[PDB]
Write an enzyme that holds these catalytic residues in place. Structure first.
Site, PDB file in Angstrom:
ATOM      1  N   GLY A 248       0.095  -3.874   4.557  1.00 31.36           N
ATOM      2  CA  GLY A 248      -0.226  -2.147   4.770  1.00 31.36           C
ATOM      3  C   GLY A 248       0.902  -0.977   4.885  1.00 31.36           C
ATOM      4  O   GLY A 248       1.798  -1.656   4.712  1.00 31.36           O
ATOM      5  N   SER A 249       0.654   0.042   5.193  1.00 29.96           N
ATOM      6  CA  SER A 249       0.856   1.427   5.515  1.00 29.96           C
ATOM      7  C   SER A 249       1.792   1.177   6.615  1.00 29.96           C
ATOM      8  O   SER A 249       2.664   1.932   6.911  1.00 29.96           O
ATOM      9  CB  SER A 249       0.037   2.700   5.391  1.00 29.96           C
ATOM     10  OG  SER A 249      -0.177   2.470   4.361  1.00 29.96           O
TER      11      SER A 249
ATOM     12  N   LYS B  91      -8.293   0.222  -5.753  1.00 29.58           N
ATOM     13  CA  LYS B  91      -9.541  -0.288  -4.786  1.00 29.58           C
ATOM     14  C   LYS B  91     -10.660   0.005  -5.513  1.00 29.58           C
ATOM     15  O   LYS B  91     -11.285   1.618  -5.618  1.00 29.58           O
ATOM     16  CB  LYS B  91      -9.135  -0.355  -3.802  1.00 29.58           C
ATOM     17  CG  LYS B  91      -8.767  -0.654  -2.591  1.00 29.58           C
ATOM     18  CD  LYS B  91      -8.112  -0.368  -1.297  1.00 29.58           C
ATOM     19  CE  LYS B  91      -6.925  -1.194  -0.373  1.00 29.58           C
ATOM     20  NZ  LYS B  91      -6.623  -2.957  -0.729  1.00 29.58           N
TER      21      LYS B  91
ATOM     22  N   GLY C 147      -6.394  -3.159   9.186  1.00 24.08           N
ATOM     23  CA  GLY C 147      -5.599  -3.014  10.371  1.00 24.08           C
ATOM     24  C   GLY C 147      -5.952  -3.205  11.504  1.00 24.08           C
ATOM     25  O   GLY C 147      -6.155  -1.750  12.636  1.00 24.08           O
TER      26      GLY C 147
ATOM     27  N   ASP D 176       0.612  -0.841   0.237  1.00 18.70           N
ATOM     28  CA  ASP D 176       0.378  -0.251   0.314  1.00 18.70           C
ATOM     29  C   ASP D 176       1.236   1.381   0.074  1.00 18.70           C
ATOM     30  O   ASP D 176       1.260   1.277   0.977  1.00 18.70           O
ATOM     31  CB  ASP D 176      -0.903   0.114   1.364  1.00 18.70           C
ATOM     32  CG  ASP D 176      -1.625  -0.747   0.945  1.00 18.70           C
ATOM     33  OD1 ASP D 176      -2.129  -1.749   0.135  1.00 18.70           O
ATOM     34  OD2 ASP D 176      -3.217  -1.012   2.323  1.00 18.70           O
TER      35      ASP D 176
ATOM     36  N   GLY E 128      -3.224  -7.815   7.527  1.00 16.35           N
ATOM     37  CA  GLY E 128      -2.294  -8.464   9.213  1.00 16.35           C
ATOM     38  C   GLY E 128      -1.471  -8.970   9.223  1.00 16.35           C
ATOM     39  O   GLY E 128      -0.430  -9.046   9.999  1.00 16.35           O
TER      40      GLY E 128
END
Ligand SMILES: *Cc1c(COP(=O)(O)O)cnc(C)c1O
Ligand SMILES: *Cc1c(COP(=O)(O)O)cnc(C)c1O
Ligand SMILES: *Cc1c(COP(=O)(O)O)cnc(C)c1O
Ligand SMILES: *Cc1c(COP(=O)(O)O)cnc(C)c1O
Ligand SMILES: *Cc1c(COP(=O)(O)O)cnc(C)c1O
Lengths: 267, 266, 267, 266, 266
Positions: free
Chosen positions: C231-232, C77, C149, C20, C210
């Site tokens: 992710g970030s 997305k 998240g 991301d 995750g």
């Protein structure tokens, strides 16, 4: 090992039909028809339960009379958990004990410790967990429970498909997941792993309970069983020798539809 | 072999294992007589209280602790996180604790511990859990007790559960053991081994809530082989004294005079 | 077939990490670290939801800026069922659309008819039924949903073990039982049989949701995934290039514990 | 006549209706190409969030908006508040929206809209609600969607519900339509009219949660005749640009190049 | 291939299939114009009434019926009993009816009918069941209706369910068909084939409770391709007349004058 010797004895029955017999005459008809063994039993346990009764081990005298009448092996039933009935059966000199839910349960919580005997035992099962628990207790041979006293094959099909299906699942299963699988089965992990290594049950596996027609018997064999047990329905017929022979031929030639037509036609 | 790993953990009998967050605490633990140290970078309760996931510690901090002491070093992997365990083994530490104190990584399966050379310790709350962890390859067992509270009640429950069912096995009719193993959902061969031995086939330590010398000696009198203690030792004004007090309570658990002496003014 | 061409294109991502990125600078860091693709997204959808908002397709302007900054493929997305968001993304000229439950659901009952598009889609799943339904709708690539998240790998492990476990069960299943299996999965029988014959999903399968550490990424590869999304969290640290490279190296060297120590040490 | 009112609403096909709170916003909406404006004095969500009842707006502010634009002006009446509707009609506006966005005034009955000269728009969530509002005299239907969120999911649900049941009618055995009308609790004659037409007997707009150009074009591709949009247009830094973007998305809903252009940098 | 079996069954369109228990009944059925006969030795309701399992009939009685007629002969196998089906195929009959009227042999699985050369009929109560049986290899579908009662209500329900869902599917938004197949738990490819064809991709007969000429014509007017009728034909005074009346009701299902004539005095 003593257990492996018992397992080898039951392996001699592969491809065979075991027939319930209530006297020496029926035992001789079973043997002459090609049965691989006979199951001695003095009264239909369903009839005993009908008129308010407890179905037990048969009289040793009637079992001896059957054993003397035939050369093929003789089995007889003991109530679940009734280890003294099994001691008596072994002392008669028969070949197998069937620890049988068709007789009246004698111990609600425990089966017989079958490793305490020289004679091989057959036990019933409805799923892989039951099969492996009976084997760990010492059973040298497994049958489905099916459904007793109805002639309806549906429960035996359920039990065969359950046992065979879980064995197939165990084949490709991630080894790391087998511990939890054994926990969920409530079965001994070492026997679960042995079954995974073999790709089948570590003892012979017969169908029993509701096997009524040649088509039923061949169905069980095509589903993967090693043989079948059949009840007294053979002898309620007008031609027991023909009915018994038809089941034997259906098991020997289970993948030959022409033979299945022949033995079923006019039956 | 499994028996070799079991023998390694047996060397810790009579010992106290101490959580340490840096090399200085590791040295204090060793100087106090700890039998091993448990390297861990942050208190997992503070990690979770701040909305976080508690994982394997950084290999760098684990190596620093291992370099600082001669006694064995343990470190934690999340339940089911077999790659965290591969990393910990490759660091060169002595034991892996597959720990419910960290965040669960696999809800349905634990690590296949037989795949490793290094011994594992696992927790348990009853005999069924203990034997299942052993069958997966754990070479050492501890109670789970209760983490982050200093309350001994759950460790007492777990010790009494495991020990009580082991005692039930001693006189049990052999014919009833098959059903007992079914009800425990534990492997029959290990149930029978526990019956023959009269104890768990591996060393059995108390963990989770062991706060005072009295607690530590209580666990030894209930039959444990040793105890784990947490970071509370280093929250006091004299960590060396408190660490020594637990060590002495475990070594001298049946000596009330010693227990008074190490507790007085603590 | 057009579908087979899309499925074949995604094979280039095997062995890769998808990152991301929220701007062109992060996209360059991802490419320089060895990412196989980037996922353009303007804000964290969890922080949008935490602000009591609706998380949608990102502004085409920010997506174009990322596409112009890198040579590796760019994904973006669209909300589930929002086929017009997907039409816009396709017209931007990006490489893949992720029909993503991380954004706010736009159609509660239907996903996008992905066969209507030239651009390939990646969809999430939690079990084999979801994976096969997304594929039949036209997804050319599958990822787990995991848990967004949180940095907690537990749900991704659950999803990987669920999909892989059912594929292993299917591989050995009695053919006659597959019809009922497809019924119980609520998945198309033809795709179930294709999966049985292949022994794996018919499309590339990544872990997502995750994946936080090198250990997590190598765990997913050892469980059988073809690659991972991250992710970030990479760019929240003090040395993003180092953390991004550590994940890439963990996926490349997933079976080498010595390398996993090296990239994890001091991270 | 009812057919005259229906024909008035048909003039809005292909259009965007914009909520406006003053004459300046009304001018911006008209200059952007809106087909009509919805006069409303305060956001009913803020009225309710401050513990209040949202009612018909002051006729004075409605008149100011009507005086500022040439395109038709709509205003809201509470459900069942037929006197609010009498006042709105006497102002000289073009449409009344009997609106669940305002505070419900009659829990059991809607306005008898056939008693008015001015056309009404009513909301719906399914075909039964749509046909009941039409039988009461609504000349135009919109989805209810979800107010005050910018989330399109409920409008999608309502459009798919109405359109799906209309499609079910096309091939339905005539003999089964009686029971279908019973289950819908809708008038059989209107159910049969919808079956013969293959669509609703009045224009059908999307409303409630239409936030972006992509949302507006989505509603048109699902088969709506137009869209309502709320005050979010005037919350941005460039209201004229955002209003124009929605108008263009509805006019050019099947042109992805146009949708990119109006969305880029928005 | 499957399409050969499907095409073969199309020959039965417009026909009546009659249960027969011996060769004489089979000859009466053929002379009256039946398109096929269903050989069965005893009434499965009487077998279950006396506490018994209803199975495949004796091959001897099936062969006698097959040798008595030129029209195709069907016979029943228990659901899931693939060996009963192997025997029936080896007899040389024309169709196997995998029948819920016999005692269920496998609670979880039907016969893999693609493994056979001979075509199969299967029952259904809704579109999901019909398409699942077809995917397993059924070349012909009948309703289950209600067995042993002569009450047509369940057959009406099943015909209306299958036909109603096909009519809905025909006009459904293509994008919604994926979810529709999921909810039916039916194979998507077959769902789409049915949508494009506009009817079931195999012959569809009514069965279960078809008692009078009026019943038989009702099923044809509802859209069926033919009907099955039971032993009630031969449990009356003039079997040839009663058999001819059903045949004529199916051939002339839209002619009330013919329906009166065949029903009068019946
Ligand atoms: C088959 C059967 C069992 C099986 O015993 P488990 O210990 O559960 O494996 C028990 N009781 C009865 C009555 C049975 O028929
Ligand atoms: C202790 C524990 C277990 C134990 O696993 P079993 O397979 O039931 O023995 C499982 N999950 C969690 C979270 C635990 O703490
Ligand atoms: C994954 C997911 C689905 C999956 O759709 P199915 O049709 O059930 O396969 C649906 N809704 C949401 C919100 C999801 O996250
Ligand atoms: C939409 C709506 C209705 C619709 O009324 P029906 O008579 O049920 O068609 C009623 N009440 C409220 C509050 C509504 O929002
Ligand atoms: C019709 C019927 C079925 C249908 O099987 P599905 O797999 O559910 O389509 C199953 N069992 C019985 C007893 C039936 O009569």
């Amino acid at each position: 090992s003593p257990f492996s010797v018992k397992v080898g004895l039951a392996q001699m029955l592969r491809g065979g039909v075991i027939m319930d017999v209530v006297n020496a005459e029926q035992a001789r008809i079973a043997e002459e028809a090609g049965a691989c063994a006979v199951m001695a039993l003095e009264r239909v346990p369903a009839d005993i339960r009908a008129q308010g009764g407890v179905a037990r081990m048969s009289d040793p005298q009637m079992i001896k009379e059957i054993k003397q009448a035939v050369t093929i092996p003789v089995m007889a039933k003991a109530r679940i958990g009734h280890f003294v009935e099994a001691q008596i059966l072994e002392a008669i000199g028969i070949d197998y004990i069937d620890e049988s839910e068709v007789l009246t349960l004698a111990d609600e919580d425990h089966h017989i410790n079958k490793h305490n005997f020289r004679i091989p035992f057959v036990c019933g099962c409805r799923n892989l967990g039951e099969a492996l628990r009976r084997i760990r207790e010492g059973a040298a041979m497994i049958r489905t429970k099916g459904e007793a006293g109805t002639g309806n094959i549906i429960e035996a099909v359920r039990h065969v498909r359950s046992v065979n299906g879980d064995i197939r699942v165990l084949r490709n299963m991630d080894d790391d997941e087998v511990f939890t699988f054994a926990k969920k089965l409530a079965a001994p992990y070492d026997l679960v792993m042995q079954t995974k290594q073999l790709g089948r049950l570590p003892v012979v596996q017969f169908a029993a309970g509701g096997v009524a027609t040649p088509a039923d018997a061949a169905l069980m064999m095509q589903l993967g069983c090693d043989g079948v047990f059949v009840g007294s329905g053979i002898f309620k017929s007008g031609d027991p020798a023909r009915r018994a022979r038809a089941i034997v031929q259906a098991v020997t030639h289970y993948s030959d539809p022409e033979m299945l037509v022949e033995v079923s036609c006019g039956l």
